Design a protein around this nucleic acid. Structure first.
Lengths: 148, 228, 71
RNA sequence: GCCGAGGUAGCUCAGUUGGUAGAGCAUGCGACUGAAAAUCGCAGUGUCGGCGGUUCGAUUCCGCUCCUCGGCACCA
RNA sequence: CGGGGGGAACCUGGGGAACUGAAACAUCUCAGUACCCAGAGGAGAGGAAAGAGAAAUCGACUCCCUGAGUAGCGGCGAGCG
RNA sequence: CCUGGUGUUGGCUCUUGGUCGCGCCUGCGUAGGAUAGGUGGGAGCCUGUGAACCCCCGCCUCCGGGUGGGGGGGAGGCGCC
RNA sequence: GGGGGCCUGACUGCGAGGCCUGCAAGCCGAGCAGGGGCGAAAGCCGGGCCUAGUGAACCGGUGGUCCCGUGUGGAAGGGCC
């Protein structure tokens, strides 16, 4: 009984499986529900439909990721800070990075995913680690300096 | 998981997972154990029979066609030229009705008894009493009675062994010498393969030669595949 | 007609016998059954969309209703 | 005919290394029995249905064999 | 838009019997017969081969003769065939 | 009618028996240092105890003792004979 | 008919021809061949001193056979002893 799972993994553990639930057992016991279907070149196709789908989606993520990876790991990011010869008056928030690079230079990235324990206000610059995608981390030359 | 046997190195040599084959066996055994002298490697096995009905209590002998001069003493019981022929060939114990008489008194220094048909009546009836309930009496269907006394003990010392199954169903016998030429050891493993397959009673049904192994006296244990 | 099958026809007939063998083990059989019988399947249902049923019979049944499970 | 089953001393039960046998109850002798039964002590007392056999040795282990009892298919 | 209600014998499918025979009577015979039925007709029936057949051979179905009452079926009995 | 199997007659869990595979422990009739389960091969075996002296502990019972470990250490013991 | 020695024909393939007989039954048999066995040998022995110790046909079994196998090499099955 090629039982196809909609919301199953031997509990509501959803799509991603198909197991044998013996005759009727399977039938009206485990799949009448709203939890699955059965074989059919049709259902198998379904699996192929979104296996493909996601394979291309993720592939893509990888891709756009790469375009930004390269553009950014390539270029430098200089920012107009205001203060003394160390930490500016009100810090460099990696989000400060975010919008500054975003619309003053070209490409944006959400604040969040980056590498900023505490805003940095030392000034000068450091190239840091902000991972735009979790296997592909984008490092970059971030310099801010007192245009005081 | 560790035991009491410096055998430890040698056993390390071992590795029970593949009941492999004959010649392999000769070689690995040979390398396996030359303790204080050279291993008395041997072969041991069991048969899917059942002695509770002697209709399959097997024995006989395959003359390992290789040199010897030892094992299971034998008495050649007969007369004149037979005593000649027999002792000559190679007999541990030799004589006629006087040696049998010695037995009646209290002497059976002979595990096996090979008597020629010129003293079979005397052997079987005088010593019927003495040798019957053990198995040490010449029997005309038990490799123990024949005019061929010289041929018989001859073999006993030129290259003898023979068979016999013990209680629950197994056979025990020497199929080669330790340091001996491997190929050779193979030759003998086979000698046994054949003679055995032969003796193998007709009251079988399935796996008869169940477990056939090359193992040594005080040494390794290697199951073997005497098919190849 | 009120119980052929539905996923085809399984509604009828048959004459049935009996004796007591020993054929290829010893001798002839033994025969004395000029008897007659029934012999049939079973019924069940599911739903078009809240409202349905079935009727039907056994096997041809099961994989069939499945067929309408496809639609 | 098949398989499970009972077969030892007058009555009836006991052991799978077998390897050494009875026991409860009656029968014989002896105390308690002032009667008795009952009690105790003792003794007597046996192939474990038949035969060989694996068996040093097995009666319970190996095979076939008697009369038996329970349930199945035989003659068409 | 159609059916239905008919129709002597004929046809197909559904269901389906004792006598009688076997000088009894239980497998068997009478038979897939009589009879109840639904249904097409003017005829229905069947109708291009998972066929037949052993020679490297035929080639839809139907019907008449023949093939044998042989091959054979079976209390291998009455018979059936 | 009663009555195993089986089909629709699906879930979760408690559980107990046989059989084969591997592993462990196991065999006390008498002579037998000694509780010898067989039949082999067979006078040699061992040093992570430097020893069978002693120590406890784990285990199996028919007095003992068989078996498997930890420890205490200064060429010995045991098999053969 | 009483005793003793050796031995198995208490044989196969077969029997010309006769007994009673409607049927099929049942009954007697010299001699031919292979092959033994008793005697030296003239020979006698294919059960017993004889008449009762009895059952066709079917179905099916078993020890040979090594005749038939439904394409063909087999085989289940099958024919004969």
């Amino acid at each position: 009984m090629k039982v196809i799972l909609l919301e199953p993994l031997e509990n509501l553990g959803d799509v991603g499986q198909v197991v044998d639930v013996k005759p009727g057992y399977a039938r009206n016991y485990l799949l009448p529900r709203g939890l699955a279907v059965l074989a059919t070149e049709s259902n198998l196709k379904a699996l192929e439909a979104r296996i493909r789908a996601q394979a291309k989606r993720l592939a893509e993520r990888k891709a756009e990721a790469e375009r930004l990876k390269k553009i950014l790991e390539n270029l430098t990011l200089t920012i107009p800070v205001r203060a003394g010869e160390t930490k500016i008056y009100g810090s460099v928030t990696a989000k400060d990075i975010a919008e500054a690079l975003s619309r003053q230079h070209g490409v944006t990235i959400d604040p969040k995913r980056l590498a900023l324990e505490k805003p940095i206000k030392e000034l000068g610059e450091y190239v840091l680690t902000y991972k735009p995608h979790p296997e592909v981390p984008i490092q970059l030359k971030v310099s801010v300096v007192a245009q005081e | 998981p560790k035991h009491g046997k410096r055998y430890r190195a040698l056993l390390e040599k071992v590795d029970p997972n593949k009941i492999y084959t004959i010649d392999e066996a000769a070689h690995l055994v040979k390398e396996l154990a030359t303790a204080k002298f050279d291993e008395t490697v041997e072969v041991h096995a069991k048969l899917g029979i059942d002695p509770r009905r002697s209709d399959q209590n097997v024995r006989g002998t395959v003359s390992l066609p290789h040199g010897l001069g030892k094992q299971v003493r034998v008495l050649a019981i007969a007369k004149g030229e037979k005593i000649k022929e027999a002792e000559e060939a190679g007999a541990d114990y030799v004589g006629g009705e006087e040696i049998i008489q010695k037995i009646l008194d209290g002497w059976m220094d002979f595990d096996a008894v090979v008597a020629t048909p010129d003293v079979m009546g005397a052997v079987g009836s005088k010593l019927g009493r003495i040798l019957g309930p053990r198995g040490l009496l010449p029997n005309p269907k038990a490799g123990t009675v024949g005019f061929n006394i010289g041929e018989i003990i001859r073999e006993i010392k030129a290259g003898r062994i023979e068979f016999r199954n013990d209680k629950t169903g197994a056979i025990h016998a020497p199929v080669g010498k330790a340091s001996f030429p491997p190929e050779k050891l193979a030759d003998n493993i086979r000698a046994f393969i054949r003679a055995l397959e032969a003796h193998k009673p007709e009251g079988a049904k399935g796996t008869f030669l169940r477990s056939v192994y090359v193992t040594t006296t005080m040494g390794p244990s290697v199951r073997i595949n005497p098919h190849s | 007609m009120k119980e052929g099958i539905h996923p085809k026809l399984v509604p009828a007939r048959i004459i049935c016998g009996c004796g007591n063998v020993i054929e290829t083990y010893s001798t002839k059989p033994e025969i004395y059954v000029e008897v007659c019988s029934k012999c049939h399947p079973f019924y069940t249902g599911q739903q078009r969309f809240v409202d349905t049923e079935g009727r039907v019979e056994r096997f041809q049944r099961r994989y069939g209703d499945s067929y309408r499970k496809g639609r």
